């Protein structure tokens, strides 16, 4: 039993009263779905390749919608706390459970990401991915920032939190700020 979040009666994996999320890591160097780079280019700001930023699964990204540009939840921050769990054969147990806050700067569309991001409703609607999670966070790893956490697709609990001030200031230069 590598996944430590138990499905509830509605199939949603939870831990100690809190919703769980799956995670992966990605690299692609695109500007991304929140416009976090100079307008009209596909060039991300360096901070959006370097910092703790995420591409959530589509239905969370756009709060139930299908918009992949300036999704409703662009610029939100989420605190992710490892449980010690992972999906068997698709991750491992991390060295510690220190929480980490990530800012939403991109989207993980359903299209091309069925296993992890194929979730057909937003959190609260009891729709889950193929591993039983209501939401997925793909974590930017271009400069090894997730490798430095030693996170190998950990299972986490998730919640929205106010963004740290540096991330809030970064987001102000994304094109989707005030969209």
UniProtKB/TrEMBL annotation:
Cystines in this chain: 5-20, 34-74, 36-174, 70-176, 77-163, 108-117
GO MF term (any one): cellulase activity
Organism of origin: Pomacea maculata (Giant applesnail)
Highest taxon above the source species: Eukaryota
Coiled-coil stretches: none
Protein known as: Endo-beta-1,4-glucanase
InterPro entries documented for this protein: RlpA-like_sf
Gene: EG27II
Transmembrane segments: none
EC numbers: 3.2.1.4
UniProt keyword Amino-acid biosynthesis present: no
Keywords: Glycosidase, Hydrolase, Signal
